[PDB]
Structures are given as structure tokens and as C-alpha cells.
Amino acid sequence: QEPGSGIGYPYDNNTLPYVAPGPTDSRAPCPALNALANHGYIPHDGRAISRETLQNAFLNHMGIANSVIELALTNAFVVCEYVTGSDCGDSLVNLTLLAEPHAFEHDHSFSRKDYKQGVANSNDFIDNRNFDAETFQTSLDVVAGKTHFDYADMNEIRLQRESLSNELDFPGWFTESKPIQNVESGFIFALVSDFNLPDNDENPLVRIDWWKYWFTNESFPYHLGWHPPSPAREIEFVTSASSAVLAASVTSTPSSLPSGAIGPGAEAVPLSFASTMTPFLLATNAPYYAQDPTLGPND
Ligand code: HEM
Ligand SMILES: *[C@@H]1O[C@H](CO)[C@@H](O[C@@H]2O[C@H](CO)[C@@H](O)[C@H](O)[C@H]2NC(C)=O)[C@H](O)[C@H]1NC(C)=O
Ligand SMILES: *[C@@H]1O[C@H](CO)[C@@H](O[C@@H]2O[C@H](CO)[C@@H](O)[C@H](O)[C@H]2NC(C)=O)[C@H](O)[C@H]1NC(C)=O
Ligand SMILES: *[C@@H]1O[C@H](CO)[C@@H](O)[C@H](O)[C@H]1NC(C)=O
Ligand SMILES: *[C@H]1O[C@H](CO)[C@@H](O)[C@H](O)[C@@H]1O
Ligand SMILES: *[C@H]1O[C@H](CO)[C@@H](O)[C@H](O)[C@@H]1O
Ligand SMILES: *[C@H]1O[C@H](CO)[C@@H](O)[C@H](O)[C@@H]1O
Ligand SMILES: *[C@H]1O[C@H](CO)[C@@H](O)[C@H](O)[C@@H]1O
Ligand SMILES: *[C@H]1O[C@H](CO)[C@@H](O)[C@H](O)[C@@H]1O
Ligand SMILES: *[C@H]1O[C@H](CO)[C@@H](O)[C@H](O)[C@@H]1O
Ligand SMILES: *[C@H]1O[C@H](CO)[C@@H](O)[C@H](O)[C@@H]1O
Ligand SMILES: *[C@H]1O[C@H](CO)[C@@H](O)[C@H](O)[C@@H]1O
Ligand SMILES: [Mn+2]
Numbered sequence: 001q002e003p004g005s006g007i008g009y010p011y012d013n014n015t016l017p018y019v020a021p022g023p024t025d026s027r028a029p030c031p032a033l034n035a036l037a038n039h040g041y042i043p044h045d046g047r048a049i050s051r052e053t054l055q056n057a058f059l060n061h062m063g064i065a066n067s068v069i070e071l072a073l074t075n076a077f078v079v080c081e082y083v084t085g086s087d088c089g090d091s092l093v094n095l096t097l098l099a100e101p102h103a104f105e106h107d108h109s110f111s112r113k114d115y116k117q118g119v120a121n122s123n124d125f126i127d128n129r130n131f132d133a134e135t136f137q138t139s140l141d142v143v144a145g146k147t148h149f150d151y152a153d154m155n156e157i158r159l160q161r162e163s164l165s166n167e168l169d170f171p172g173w174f175t176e177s178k179p180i181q182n183v184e185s186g187f188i189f190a191l192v193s194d195f196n197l198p199d200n201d202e203n204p205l206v207r208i209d210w211w212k213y214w215f216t217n218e219s220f221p222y223h224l225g226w227h228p229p230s231p232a233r234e235i236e237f238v239t240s241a242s243s244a245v246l247a248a249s250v251t252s253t254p255s256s257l258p259s260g261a262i263g264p265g266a267e268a269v270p271l272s273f274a275s276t277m278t279p280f281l282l283a284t285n286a287p288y289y290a291q292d293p294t295l296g297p298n299d
Contacts, residue, residue, distance in 0.1 A: 001298040011227040012061055016040045017297035018219045021287035028095035029105050029129040034218040046095035063228030067235035074270050075104045082273045099129035101280045106177035108165040111136040111215055116170040130288035148205040152248040154185050162261050163254035176258045178265035185245045186238035217290045
């Protein structure tokens with residue numbers, strides 16, 4: 001928001017306006033990174049980003065401590081090298097390369113289509129980076145009619161997404177990725193769980209309207225009563241939530257579910273790519289931005 005508006009006060013006293021990305025700007029398959037870039041907390045064009053810029057943007061404007069993004073940082077730079085062919089040092093070339101399939105970017109996302117989702121030819125691939133309203137809708141349907149949801153509901157959502165992707169993706173493409181996806185499940189509870197509730201730290205409930213605003217608009221739900229969590233969330237909360245989701249009892253099992261989908265998952269670890277392996281081509285679609293309605297500077 002405009003600095004003088006005082007919208008983020010007293011949680012964020014140094015805000016910047018929202019500015020929609022242009023045809024030449026670089027965006028990622030991450031709703032958190034895109035929101036930061038749209039506000040200029042990280043380069044608005046999504047290029048040449050240092051670890052320290054990432055750390056400060058997250059901590060100061062999203063209430064996310066350094067421990068939370070430690071592994072994400074490592075994996076971002078590992079992928080940069082794999083895609084560009086050379087070490088990226090401390091300057092992430094761009095956000096777009098983060099959408100390199102079967103790496104950090106994984107199948108069965110909550111709001112993006114898979115790289116080879118519903119393609120007639122093996123050589124075809126599609127936009128697995130930009131926000132897809134229809135895909136997000138398949139996530140929202142699971143909790144239709146509710147205002148909040150818990151760990152059990154989230155487990156149902158990720159199960160529905162895995163079933164759909166396993167069925168729609170070109171034969172042989174689908175690859176389950178529970179460790180990374182559920183850290184992201186934890187990210188969601190860390191950022192948009194309802195801190196107004198008495199036992200938010202032990203039994204966090206996600207506010208659906210906050211979640212919708214963030215994902216769809218790629219900006220912050222201040223107009224809805226949201227504010228960065230204070231104190232800043234630490235990695236402890238995220239991995240615990242991740243674990244609680246996969247441990248939640250399932251009351252509805254979808255069909256065509258990949259083997260071992262139900263049950264605990266392994267902890268996320270840094271990625272590694274064989275030097276013999278060539279990267280997949282990146283989708284070249286222009287950056288997505290909210291159009292119904294378009295956002296103003298304070299949205
Ligand atoms: C520098 C740190 C980060 C990097 C490099 C990063 C990278 C990525 C990438 C590559 C994806 C995978 C896309 C997919 O296949 O679903 C993604 C997804 C996502 N990220 Fe981030 N991210 C970071 C931090 C965060 C944080 C701290 C949050 C929020 C508190 C966040 C929330 C999400 C969510 C919820 C998704 C999943 C969207 C979906 O499945 O539709 N990210 N991020
Ligand atoms: C995306 O952001 C816009 C702007 O903040 C949201 O539109 C506001 O929504 C509430 C409830 O629908 C209205 O009372 C406001 O007056 C709306 N403002 C405008 C300019 O229309 C929109 O709801 C957000 N989208 C999602 C999915 O959360
Ligand atoms: C982000 O960086 C990647 C890696 O440099 C860019 O992708 C390459 O772009 C060149 C020129 O368009 C192509 O010859 C390569 O084949 C691309 N690599 C891959 C793996 O697809 C990408 O264009 C950059 N994107 C943005 C928006 O800046
Ligand atoms: C925002 O400003 C108020 C008053 O100056 C102060 O008490 C508060 O701690 C500030 N918030 C942050 C995150 O610095
Ligand atoms: C989230 O974190 C838990 C605990 O590390 C994992 O078991 C899960 O697979 C996901 O990575
Ligand atoms: C979640 O899990 C991680 C590792 O899996 C722990 O470091 C953290 O304390 C929390 O228990
Ligand atoms: C780990 O931490 C989360 C969030 O604080 C709890 O909900 C979970 O019960 C476990 O204690
Ligand atoms: C990982 O952590 C969560 C929260 O402590 C547990 O509920 C789960 O059973 C697993 O041990
Ligand atoms: C785990 O437990 C739930 C209730 O908590 C059952 O309804 C479900 O079928 C599963 O066995
Ligand atoms: C059993 O309960 C879960 C949440 O606890 C629902 O998401 C599911 O649809 C079923 O009714
Ligand atoms: C029960 O609910 C789950 C999640 O909503 C579905 O995927 C399943 O098909 C059944 O209808
Ligand atoms: C649907 O079916 C699976 C596997 O049979 C169960 O684990 C789940 O609890 C639900 O009843
Ligand atoms: Mn994906």
C-alpha cells in the first residue's frame with residue numbers, strides 16, 4: 001500500500017504500492033514471491049535477486065523468519081545452476097526459471113496446471129507457472145461452504161489434487177512430491193491461519209477468504225483484516241503443520257490415487273541434478289495479473 005496510507009500499521013510501517021507486472025517482467029510459480037515482486041519488496045521485474053533481499057522482504061513484510069526459507073533458498077540456487085548451466089552465485093537470474101518441471105516445481109499443485117496436463121502429444125507441454133483459476137477451483141470445492149478449514153481438510157485437498165493430476169497428466173509424467181508440497185501446506189497455515197482465534201498456535205485454522213485473496217490477487221489481504229503474523233513464524237511451526245496434515249485421518253478417499261499417497265511423508269531435503277541431464281524448456285507465457293477487477297495501489 002501507499003506508505004502514507006497506514007494500512008499495514010503497526011505491523012508493517014514501511015509498505016509499498018501494488019504495481020501489476022508487465023509482458024517483460026519475470027514472475028514465478030510461487031504466490032509468495034509474486035506478491036513481494038508486485039510490491040517491489042524484491043525487484044519488480046523479477047530479476048537479479050540476492051538471498052539477503054529475499055530474507056529481508058519475507059521477514060519485514062510477511063512475518064516469515066529466516067529459518068522458514070533456509071531450504072527454499074538453497075533449492076532456488078541449485079535450480080538456477082541446473083537451468084542456466086552455471087553457478088548463479090548470489091544473484092538469482094530470474095523468477096521464471098523456478099518453474100523448471102520436476103525439480104523445485106512439482107506436480108499436483110493447488111493452483112497451477114501440470115507441465116504435461118491434458119496434452120495430446122508427448123512433446124507438448126503447457127503453462128505450469130501462472131495462476132489458473134479453474135485449477136484453484138478444484139482445491140476450493142473440497143471446502144465449499146466453509147469459512148475456515150483444518151489439517152484434516154488440507155489433507156483432503158492435497159489428495160484431490162493428486163488424484164486429478166494422476167489422471168489428467170500425459171501417461172508417464174505424473175510424479176508425486178509429498179515432501180515439498182506439504183512444506184507448502186505448512187506455509188499456508190503459517191501465513192493465513194486465523195490468529196484471532198484463542199488456540200491458533202496449537203490448532204490453526206486457515207481463513208478461506210484470506211487464502212483466496214492472496215492466491216488470486218497476488219497481493220496481501222489487508223482489506224480483510226489480515227496482517228503479517230507477529231512474532232514472525234519460524235520453521236518449527238511449518239514442519240509441525242506439514243506433519244499434522246499428513247497424519248490427519250481421511251474421511252473420503254478419491255479414486256486413481258497414486259501408490260502410497262495416504263500416510264506420512266519424508267522430510268524435504270536439498271535437490272541434486274545429474275550433469276548428464278538437460279533441463280526441460282520453460283513455459284514462455286506472459287505474467288498473470290488480476291483482471292476481474294484489476295488492483296489499485298492499495299490492494
Ligand atoms: C525464497 C523462498 C521461496 C522460494 C524459492 C519458493 C519457491 C516456490 C516454488 C518453486 C514453488 C513450487 C510450485 C509448485 O509446483 O507448486 C512454490 C510454491 C508455493 N509457495 Fe513458494 N517459495 C519460497 C517461499 C515461500 C513462502 C515463505 C511461502 C509462504 C508463506 C510460499 C508459499 C508457496 C505456496 C503456498 C506454494 C504452492 C502453490 C500451489 O501449489 O498452487 N513460498 N514456491
Ligand atoms: C482481489 O482484490 C480486490 C481488491 O481488493 C477484491 O475486491 C474487493 O472485494 C470485496 C469483497 O468482494 C469488496 O467489498 C471490495 O469493495 C472489492 N473491491 C473492488 C475494487 O472491487 C477482490 O475480492 C479480491 N479477490 C479475491 C478472490 O479475494
Ligand atoms: C529466465 O531465465 C531463463 C534461463 O536463462 C530463460 O530461459 C531461457 O531463455 C532463452 C532465451 O529466450 C532460451 O534459449 C532457453 O531455451 C531458455 N531456457 C529454458 C530452460 O527454457 C528465460 O527466458 C528467462 N525468463 C524471463 C521471463 O526472463
Ligand atoms: C510501527 O510503528 C509504531 C509506532 O512508531 C511502533 O510501536 C511499532 O513497533 C512499529 N512497528 C514495527 C514493525 O516496527
Ligand atoms: C512437511 O514436513 C514434514 C516434517 O518434516 C514432512 O514429513 C512432510 O513430508 C513435509 O515435508
Ligand atoms: C518440524 O520438523 C522439523 C524437521 O522435520 C523440525 O526441525 C521442527 O522442529 C519441527 O518439529
Ligand atoms: C507442531 O506445531 C503445530 C503448530 O504450532 C501444532 O499445530 C502441532 O500440533 C505440533 O504441536
Ligand atoms: C509429525 O508431527 C505432527 C505434529 O507433532 C504429528 O501429529 C504427526 O503425527 C507426526 O509425528
Ligand atoms: C480416521 O479417523 C476418522 C475420525 O477421526 C474416521 O472417520 C476415518 O474414517 C479414519 O478412519
Ligand atoms: C470427512 O471429514 C473431512 C474433514 O474432517 C472432510 O474434508 C471430508 O470431506 C469428509 O467429510
Ligand atoms: C470424498 O471427498 C474427496 C475430497 O472432497 C473426493 O476427492 C472423493 O472423491 C470423495 O468424493
Ligand atoms: C478412504 O480409503 C482409504 C484407504 O482404504 C482410507 O485410509 C481412508 O481413511 C478413507 O477411508
Ligand atoms: Mn506445480
